[PDB]
Design a protein around this ligand. Structure first.
Ligand SMILES: Nc1ncnc2c1ncn2[C@@H]1O[C@H](COP(=O)(O)OP(=O)(O)O)[C@@H](O)[C@H]1O
Ligand SMILES: Nc1ncnc2c1ncn2[C@@H]1O[C@H](COP(=O)(O)OP(=O)(O)O)[C@@H](O)[C@H]1O
Ligand SMILES: Nc1ncnc2c1ncn2[C@@H]1O[C@H](COP(=O)(O)OP(=O)(O)O)[C@@H](O)[C@H]1O
Lengths: 56, 375, 55, 375, 375
């Protein structure tokens, strides 16, 4: 009498687990573009004088 | 230079263009779909200055540029500018020439044929990509969401697609493609802000309004109660900082603009709105397929970030829907980026490696091949 | 999400049990309907058994 | 899964297949006589999806499938789909391999000969069954009911057989096979519900109408008096839940459809009804037979479960029958399944173990042998 | 305009209402089943204007109106709008009205009965008709066609009925009703024209694509050969003039729209097409009927104006039909008008003068009288 509710609840879980496993495998396999970068600055602390350009 | 020749993945919308490589969970970079051109006479010499700017360059130097968008309502009308965008997107920024990698592009399933054909043609003839596959955007939204069944309503900048998919199959007779989108919400906001005393008409002004919308606007799940107060009191207004230090406040207009997705008449459009099109995508399917589509309204694309859109899209459908039935909105964090993410997922499937147009089949058949091999 | 997945299995289980309960509730009203109907028929036939036996 | 090397029993109608093992009182499972196939274009890659669905699989995924029935009006024409249903029936749910078990199948004696020949051939050539036997549904009904004598009305999905049997003997000249069955009652209901405003045309919709009939319909003891009130008041209406949350409310149609059993003209058939067939099967037999057939009218199969049917049939035949004589109906709770039980009884009788076609006699003669060996 | 109390006749579909008076062999005027309403805010005053527009007014001022159709698949869902259309039809343009004339309505045999009940109530209580009759569209087609026998494909705007009639009698068991009609063919066309770059969404656009279909489309006797050339050559293309001076060039879409009649799967319908449907209406009738129905395939209603339909239908039925038998098709110039024309014939026949419901019987019984007095 319960054989089908077991089987039906399982079919739903197996499909949901499949679909989530597919997106999770890519989420976990590669993760660099999903991260961040230093984005550093210039400051010009070595600028002890004027440049060679006529504009400086 | 790469570990494997996986596909490059890029979602080209009417708003943003996003790209990265297949197998990751994010694009490396996002660009506006823009090619910019100077609208002024140069006077100083040796200032660098390009004849045309692409993507973020176009937006960054926009102070003296007129900015054009090559994509409108989901299709490419200016392929030359998309060629510039793809070069920048794939080679200048991801640092990968398409010549050595398959490329996965995207388009809606009822997207005019010329666009899926042109995307196939340019990547094969100007970039020499070894393979092509133009993805169904709804499919990618489902891949990113972890669903096989549901209505994909992608409310992007270009077009709202409204497609019912059941067990991985489309129900095409029930697709309600609608020419109501995020780009119209931006122009409506420029006009309503003009009514408030803050006129916006130029490219710079449009980019400001798009920034205002993205930070200040919302849908409101119950707009009648929300406007009764927002239109009556300053306590519901939110301030926005403009590039020159000016401050604009927006009240009921803050949600009235997004409200157009439910009230299309605000922009002169004849439409039922996105909640009724979701309803009809469900209702026009057979009764043994609607009980699953009602329980799976799949939100995707951009504009989905407005607070109240998911609840506003579930309440309206529930009101149109039969009683007893459970109506459910799925609105994951992979919003706006779900198509790109799904693209990455599709590209990495082992079964998808049999779906590619090779740069052999392409030349034998020509670009019309996209309809024989992709969709 | 894992907690919801757990929850969805047990929500689905609650639903499977709600459905089974409802099916069983129907089977109960019917099992009991029959218990009663079989007794109703028992009396109809048993009454005939008595009438016919008297006859 | 099973603890004995017993015979297998499968009663294959145009509706459903009842299958289990000989010695039980129920099929292990009931498999609809259906092979389903997708009628829509697929869009997602790597999400499984079968090319065809068999039996319960066909109904479970029916939202996008067209469902075909291999058996029509009592016989098998799509032998290929029958083999698939049987493979599934035997190996996945009954958990048996027919190669190790003799098998009993059924038909109506006035069905075309090809049916018994193809059923026999499939079990001997694709399943390698050691033995076969095609049974008479009326015989099985009499064994299940504890009788050797009576008129059996087996209510098929395809046809109704109507056969008199006396002291274990056939009286074939008095068989009144009628082209009226459960699938015709279903078609009538689809048309009558159309009159009420509910259109049911597609496979999912056709399956619903069958389900409506099964839950809401009855025949009534007195049609005209029942219609006099059913046609006048909501007090005799019943609502059915459609699988989308909507309902259909049905009134006198609730009995006008089953009434076709007494009035076949409702579906264009030239017949006076199932009580005429019962009556003539008795009347065409000798007068020293008739007394035992009048006292033993046997209800078997579906439709025998309709309120008013056992009482109505006894009333309808006693009305045609002579006075003094006792007219009686046998209608056990083993409704819609007693023929399966009869299959189980016959398959396991010691008196029947000499009735089998062996996989020696079959291989030497071919399938035409069933005509000489079974009945 | 008229000097006699002749019956009036109206053929009311989801397309247009054909109307005129009995005794004529054509409607006097055609009244689109349309109520138009402005979708814009008025700015000028002293502009006349209507609150709502009907029929031809609705189409003439359509540039700023949304146009709605009160009838869906043969059922009036909005009868307040039909009363406005009818008032105009009768009092402004035909110059006749039920008030001084008996009225005949045309309907399908399985049209939901409640729909006749409401039309009956309206003509008796709103238009004060002295008498009514609701006639079968197939009957009307047979009178107009000079026949008492045949399969009538009444090709409506929202539904096709398909009913066999023999010697003046209905053969209802062989009705093969199909949810496919001229309005669905339009939907397929607009979707394929959308693929070519010409979306049709809003009201003006919806009316244009309907007009394109009516003037450019055809079926042809052989679809695949027609496509082998139409899909390969510009010589099969036709440019249609759009209202603003622009044109749309259409290729094989010109026949793919009409083809949905033979291929309903084009719009998601689970059907084999109108020739299979016609075939079954003939084939399900007794064999001594079949010969007369094969000799009398009657095309009526709309869509039958498509070039090649007479040949496409006769050839497909001949292919499905038994050999030796002669399959014939009736496709008179009285096409699309033959239902209205038959209404004129029937209303005026001397044999029909006692078939009218009077406005005596009507008030004693109420609107439900149509269910007992007409059919
Ligand atoms: N913070 C935000 N708030 C509201 N809307 C947003 C936000 N971010 C993105 N959107 C809107 O979504 C649209 C982008 O469309 P999109 O779906 O991302 O196209 P694509 O599928 O190619 O990625 C733009 O109109 C943008 O303004
Ligand atoms: N509640 C019910 N009342 C009357 N008849 C029913 C009911 N439920 C099912 N049936 C009928 O039972 C039929 C199946 O019974 P069955 O006799 O075992 O078919 P078969 O003779 O082919 O084996 C179905 O077609 C259905 O029409
Ligand atoms: N050349 C044509 N091509 C396609 N359809 C046509 C053509 N001519 C007439 N029809 C169709 O005829 C229909 C209107 O007439 P009709 O259907 O017979 O009245 P009613 O719907 O009341 O029965 C419209 O759907 C119209 O498109």
């Amino acid at each position: 009498m319960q054989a089908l509710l077991g089987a039906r609840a399982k079919e739903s879980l197996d499909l949901r687990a499949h679909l989530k496993q597919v997106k999770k495998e890519d989420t976990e396999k590669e993760n660099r573009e999903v991260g961040d970068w230093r984005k550093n600055i210039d400051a010009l602390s070595g600028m002890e004088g004027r440049k060679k350009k006529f504009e400086s | 230079d790469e570990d494997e020749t996986t596909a490059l993945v890029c979602d080209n919308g009417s708003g943003l263009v996003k790209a990265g490589f297949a197998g990751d969970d994010a694009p490396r970079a996002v660009f506006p779909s823009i090619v910019g051109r100077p609208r002024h006479q140069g006077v100083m010499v040796g200032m660098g200055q390009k004849d045309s700017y692409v993507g973020d360059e176009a937006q960054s130097k926009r102070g003296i540029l007129t900015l054009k968008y090559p994509i409108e309502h989901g299709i490419i009308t200016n392929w030359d500018d998309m060629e510039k965008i793809w070069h920048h997107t794939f080679y200048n920024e991801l640092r990968v020439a398409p010549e050595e990698h398959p490329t996965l592009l995207t388009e809606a399933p009822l997207n005019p044929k010329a666009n899926r054909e042109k995307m196939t043609q340019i990547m094969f003839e100007t970039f020499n990509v070894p393979a092509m596959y133009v993805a169904i955007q709804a499919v990618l939204s489902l891949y990113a969401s972890g669903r096989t069944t549901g209505i994909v309503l992608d409310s992007g900048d270009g077009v709202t697609h409204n497609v019912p998919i059941y067990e991985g199959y489309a129900l095409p007779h029930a697709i309600m493609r609608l020419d109501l989108a995020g780009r119209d919400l931006t122009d409506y906001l420029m006009k309503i802000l003009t009514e408030r005393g803050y006129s916006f008409v130029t490219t710079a002004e449009r980019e400001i309004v798009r920034d205002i919308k993205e930070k200040l606007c919302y849908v409101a799940l119950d707009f009648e109660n929300e406007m009764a107060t927002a239109a009556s009191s300053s306590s519901l207004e939110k301030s926005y900082e403009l590039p020159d230090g000016q401050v604009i406040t927006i009240g009921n207009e803050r949600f009235r603009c997004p409200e157009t997705l439910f009230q299309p008449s605000f922009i002169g459009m004849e439409s039922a709105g996105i909640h009724e099109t979701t309803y009809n995508s469900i209702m026009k399917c057979d009764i043994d397929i609607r009980k699953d589509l009602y329980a799976n309204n799949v939100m995707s694309g951009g504009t989905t970030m407005y607070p109240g859109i998911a609840d506003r899209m579930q309440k309206e459908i529930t009101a149109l829907a039969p009683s007893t039935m459970k109506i459910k909105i799925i609105a994951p964090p992979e919003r706006k980026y779900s198509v790109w993410i799904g693209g990455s997922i599709l590209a990495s499937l082992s079964t998808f490696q049999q779906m590619w147009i090779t740069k052999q089949e392409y030349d034998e058949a020509g670009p019309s091949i996209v309809h024989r091999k992709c969709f | 999400d894992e907690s919801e997945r757990g929850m969805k299995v047990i929500e689905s289980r609650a639903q499977k049990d709600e459905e089974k309960m409802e099916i069983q509730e129907i089977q109960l009203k019917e099992a009991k309907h029959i218990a009663e109907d079989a007794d109703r028929k028992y009396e109809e036939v048993a009454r005939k058994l008595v009438i016919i036996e008297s006859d």
